[PDB]
Symmetry: C5
Subunit: 396 residues, 5 copies
């Protein structure tokens, strides 16, 4: 229309985009900064970066962009693109990405009385600190530091508005708790400029259904089969075969885990200790099995038990586990044959109790290793704080 | 020509690209928005993004870009590049990508009467929600939210036209069902501006031939060999060897699966339950085999059956499975030799029935584990909705 | 020089880059479009994109960029950068990449009589259809659709010139066959504008030496060792050990293959069927071995053969394979000892023929499984079209 | 305000951004360059690049950007964007990235007396030299070369200020030691221009808790089980089974290691030697086991010991390890039976000492291989310099 | 200063950046092109691209950028940014990257007499041909084609200067040999324009310490253990177990190798043949072991040797390897017992020589397979040209 064309001509008349729109060059310009979280794109522990899709709202007041409604009746608001009107230089301080702005400058709405609002969308990649302790059951606090880069305390008075979460599109992996904020001003090394800033911190809780079922559940089941060695009879030459196959089949899990675990020397993660515990329990099973096996094939008539094994593994431990354990030359020739058989029976009896001792050790170690696994798995998981709420929410 | 050069000079005379081309600054400008799907580039479940190659069509009416055909006979249409004429700021609301526009501004056609049409091509990366439940047999609905960013209800009246699918170049992985749309206007927190938008939703069905043959078919075959342990004789020291090798060879499948499965704690995927079922069936086979093995090498003369095994596994279960099961000193020396052989026969007979009990258990568990696998594999697959149509289309 | 400086001043005088350089605004401008293939960067089956490094040649005639050689003797040609003279908007229709142009605008040569030629280099990422059937022995046809975006039939008459392949730098993986082209014009949904285009199709043949030697050759060799189970004696408790280790060692190949195979449900690839055939042949070997093993450790005196096995595996199949298969009490005590030995001999004879039956089955299955593998491997490879030429070229 | 609008108009009056702001064109312009390290993004050994998030500070003095405070009372400082005032062209010399600047030009503060300061933020990817020797316990020195590109010694006198580390946000993987710097000027091949530069070197120490626990600790434990072969009795046919399974299960570690190790032929890394030592120790265990096994199943009555084994492995080594090791025809028939049994006893005795020799070798090799592993693991780790401080800090 | 401000004003007066700075428009402009290699970023065989960080030097003479030193005493040189003075359009012809220039336009130095020099830094990604034959011991020649894009022979006379390598920062993986160059002009299809160019070829030698130690050394060691099967006694049921475990553990190496090997069907790489040789040697070991095993468990009394084995493996091969290899009824009952034992001895003797034949074959195959491995490993490595220099440099 003729009024819109006319109004745009006075508005850009003698206008300098490099100038603060303050009427008096002695008072700071009040700028209201807010934030709207639309979704959490991804949280990557390896690079310790946080990708979020958010909206920004910068609102200030202009003095030269004012006009009377009566003179121009039809038009009420005007829009100016980037590079034609003064805008605040508020930007993310972290900005862990190649290009540092990440704001996608759009049109800037202008009031009928000079109140200018700016609503740019962008995808931000901030530098967060992923404290990976109690990894499946961890809560992360990520900060977003926003503030002006060239305007100090007396030039741009940065104010704060509460963050908006109307429309969040939940990720499904991380459960958002809340996004509080804070406004403060600090003194930097360069200058005597007190620089205000707005720091929005994001608190999110990691869901545990995927990690618990795909990682924690198989570990208990695989470790259970390593406990099944003591139930196999020693006759079947198969004890070490299943003893070492489970160990080989269980080292593969940290290969997946280490691909996700950041290589940070802050603290030993809970998942790292739990896997390490399974290494030792399965590893010590093979060592015990070797001791059991040599008790079976002891090659008798080559050394008797030192009389401590006859009383420990056959009287004390056994009670606990309810084991309950021309004719003259013809005669001489037959004499040797029967005596040889008699000596074979004596050797068999000596070897028989050697095998029974191995059975006692196997059964004794089964009870000892079983209670170790029960308290090791439970004890580590119980130690994690807020473990109960995650189970009560994700699982139950 | 001289007419084209002349016409371009009046057209750009006193023209402001920042002004809405409405003749009266009281009525909204009617803008027709449509869409044309050219192909689906890729659907990624891990990042929950949808990459599509589409075309856009924005058509509106201009008031200052009008001329008489008689005055300029040769020229009928003119084209203006970006930044020289007013264009709507319609953009994708989701825009899950670094740069937010993704439109590749091109020349804008102009009528002889002021009807301006704009047809920019681009590759869009929207943020979709991949509900991964019944993963091989899932249907995904992806939304595309388009609308103006700075013009409200009274400024830009956004209209809708039906989506165009003339030329789709089918992906081969996802089967397109349809792309319906909707026009609505909502109230936002910033302003009293009712903002219209056009939301095009894309419904696609995942094809199952690749996932069924490369993932589902081998799982049945590998689980079948784990069922073959009960057919192996216990004499060959090879039962646990094949019992645990199949288990080791079958854990590798979720390694491929987890690399594709998004780590979302929304619901347990169908493929996750089916793999978990195979874990337990194969895992319980090793536990049963250990019980069977200790029934074989029972070391007789160390405890008889409690008289419940003589009647259960030898009379009840066996009937079900059709098993059907100087001279005086010379005489004394020969007396011991024959008696020793007689005692060996008695011990062999006792051990013989111990081995037969193990054979009954093996055969009994073969029948029980077979029907479990048949109903577990079928039962999980039947539970998925629209399973029949995918088989009737992709396979048959 | 003074003439070059003077000439540039009249040339840009009253020049509008938005105007078609036609002298009469009623006839289309003839634009000659060609192509020069410099190399094929990469063909990716997963994303179905084709990356090529090519050159473009757009040549048209300008009316305002003309001058007399006599007036300016030294200068014969002039060059204008992008944004200063009118250029056609020909662009790739597919453009499967983030930015859509991929042309790297350079200087544009200008004749002494107005004939303007434009030779921009670029790397193009078109969207091809990789029909992966007979994957090692496949020929792919990739199209490149070029045409104007804003100028119709009556505005820009797009012509065609033959593609140039002078200098190709062969890739070494794909063998180029030829690059023919076509010029046609179609009617689109938007407008009554008949839009001409030039479609250059690229035909390339995949070389087979790498895929044949690294993938096809090991498969035959590994499957051969799975056939070696029937030659192992049943006494050595090692038949299932090598039966299942080969199967475990052979599942790893599709892990490499599936990483290359696109997940397209168009048709079952030849390499997929060939691997699936090896699964069944190796898988059925373990099933046969279990049947053979239970024929060995049959535990005699627990059931005789049903008299069909005595005649089938011992008379019919065996002929085919050339198998050819006080004193009174002293006497009574010795009577039992000899009779016990006699009964042992009878039991050994019964078990002896049980073992021989297992040997016959093993040898019989070796002949049957051998011919199956020979015709399965050859039969699948022969079915692929143009298999002979690839072997005659890549190998021989 | 009116004063800010007025001041900006004289400041940009007759101003050339291509001109050095020196009042006299005979003296170099003094530019103060500093640096502020905010965090270390990532150190990648494969590409030998160092990604850091740092801030820059370039401060110089301008002669034309001066004004009187009395004339313009309200305004004290002004800001000019890029491309409107002269700025130094200081840039990173290494710049191992696609775009070479990586500075994100921002507003430039201006004094009331002409002192201009410039504080651009950016993420820099310099080309470092990762000397990977003693890899878990290494200290890296990375250089950052900054200097002007077009201004020589007499044009831009580049000065140096101490680096700032107020706020570092420690990475958790690398421990920062310090960031010293240096200012020097060199003569280049192009010109007689002495070019000053500022080289900031970054010294960081890699933390060892993650690499020690996830890589070094399992290696000792896995190598311990390879040492357990000599404790297994030779009767259980399981020595090679555990001998070769550990070797198969231990080759997988360099697969993870080689994925991290850069392929640089500078020196053999400490982790490479330590893994290579474990290869030989585990590998030689299988060779020894084969020698031990053939001493067990020696098939007696086929060769006696050469009388050196009777004295070495049975008298010398055994003492070290405390081993301590009608009637006539009736008579003739019984004569053979007893003599046959007597010959069996003699053969058993000969085979008995053959088995005992294998037991001595097994035990002897257990002592020899144990001390080898203890000194090989400790000896390699001790050789690394500053090994003690890393253990005293990261672990203790 | 006032002189610098004044000089810049005449210099840009009536200056056209589109014009060649030649005083006479009949002679070509002499442009000197050189190169400085700073480092080799990476050489990637899969994509056949070469990433290098180099500097360029373009020097020409300008006619309009001249001034008298006396008139302007202080200033001696001036700098003009991109887009304000004429510059040559020399660019890399290969440019295997998204953006085609890769030059990072900087300030351009100007003499006091018109000699203009241009020194832009950049990271170039050229398209090289990696002839992967004798892969660990290969030398690659990579070309860099530089030349003008729009100026022909009579317009821009491109000259050449020797490449500079003062400061190379050796990569550590590739050993630079030299960078020679060449200047030539060719006739293209478009035009009668003879286009000069400068082609700098880079010759680099790959270092072998990393590839030799991490890949070649383990292959010899793993193949050695596959040769240890023939030393294992056949009694221990463990020959196939170690025979097939080594084969399973050795297929994993090409998985790493194929991830590095480009899929080019040019020639069979040396590393491919060496791995293929190890496949057959290890593979044939299992086949021989099966033949040996069936010679052990021959089940005697079921066929004698054909009298060729008695003379070949027991007389010829054995000599080579130094093997050296009421009363009447009482009497009748004892008669059978002794005769049964006598028949057992005869059967044992027949089986004894069957086992000895297997021992001869095992030992005979050990000698034959050992010399095969020695000449196969050495023979392949010796065939590679310049193998000796790499060992003499990288290793010794
Ligand atoms: O209403 C809005 N944005 C709409 C206006 N335009 C049209 C649709 C929407 C996006 C652009 C709002 C955006 C933000 C951002 C940060 C903080 C707050 Cl409190 C708000 S409220
Ligand atoms: O001759 C040429 N290009 C040269 C001219 N300049 C200098 C060297 C070369 C590149 C730039 C040609 C380029 C093309 C492109 C497409 C089709 C055809 Cl038939 C041709 S012929
Ligand atoms: O001297 C130089 N470059 C310095 C000048 N400026 C300041 C420091 C350096 C980089 C910019 C040189 C650069 C090149 C490039 C190619 C060939 C040659 Cl023979 C040379 S000589």
């Amino acid at each position: 229309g003729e009024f819109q064309r006319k109004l745009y001509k006075e508005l850009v008349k003698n206008y300098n985009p490099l100038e603060r729109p303050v009427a008096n060059d002695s008072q700071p310009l009040t700028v209201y900064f807010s934030l709207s979280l639309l979704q959490i794109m991804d949280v990557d522990e390896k690079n310790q970066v946080l990708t979020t899709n958010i909206w920004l709202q910068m609102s200030w007041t202009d003095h030269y962009l004012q006009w009377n409604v009566s003179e121009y009746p039809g038009v009420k608001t005007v829009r100016f693109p980037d590079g034609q009107i003064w805008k605040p230089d508020i930007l993310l301080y972290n900005s862990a990405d190649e290009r540092f702005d990440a704001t996608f400058h759009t049109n800037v709405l202008v009031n009928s009385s000079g109140h200018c609002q700016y609503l740019p969308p962008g995808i931000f990649k901030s530098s967060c600190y992923i404290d990976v302790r109690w990894f499946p059951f961890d809560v992360q606090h990520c900060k977003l530091k926003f503030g002006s880069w060239s305007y100090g305390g007396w030039s741009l008075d940065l104010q704060m508005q509460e963050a908006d979460i109307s429309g969040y599109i939940p990720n499904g992996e991380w459960d958002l708790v809340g996004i509080p904020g804070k406004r403060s001003e600090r003194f930097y090394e360069c200058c005597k400029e007190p620089y205000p800033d707005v720091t929005f911190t994001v608190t999110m809780r990691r869901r545990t259904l995927y990690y618990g079922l795909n990682l924690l559940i198989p570990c208990v089941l695989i470790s259970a089969l390593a406990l099944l060695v003591f139930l196999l009879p020693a006759d079947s030459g198969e004890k070490i075969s299943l003893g070492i196959t489970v160990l080989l089949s269980l080292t593969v899990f940290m290969l997946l885990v280490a691909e996700i675990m950041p290589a940070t020397s802050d603290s030993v993660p809970l998942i790292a200790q739990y896997f390490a515990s399974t290494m030792i329990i399965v590893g010590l099973s093979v060592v015990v099995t070797v001791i059991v096996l040599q008790y079976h094939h002891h090659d008798p008539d080559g050394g008797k038990m030192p009389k401590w094994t006859r009383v420990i593994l056959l009287n004390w431990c056994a009670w606990f586990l309810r084991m309950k354990r021309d004719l003259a030359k013809i005669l001489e020739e037959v004499r040797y044959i029967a005596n040889r058989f008699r000596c074979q029976d004596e050797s068999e009896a000596v070897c028989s109790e050697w095998k029974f001792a191995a059975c006692v050790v196997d059964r004794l170690c089964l009870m000892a290793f079983s209670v170790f696994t029960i308290i090791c798995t439970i004890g580590i998981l119980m130690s994690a704080p807020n473990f109960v709420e995650a189970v009560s929410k994700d699982f139950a």
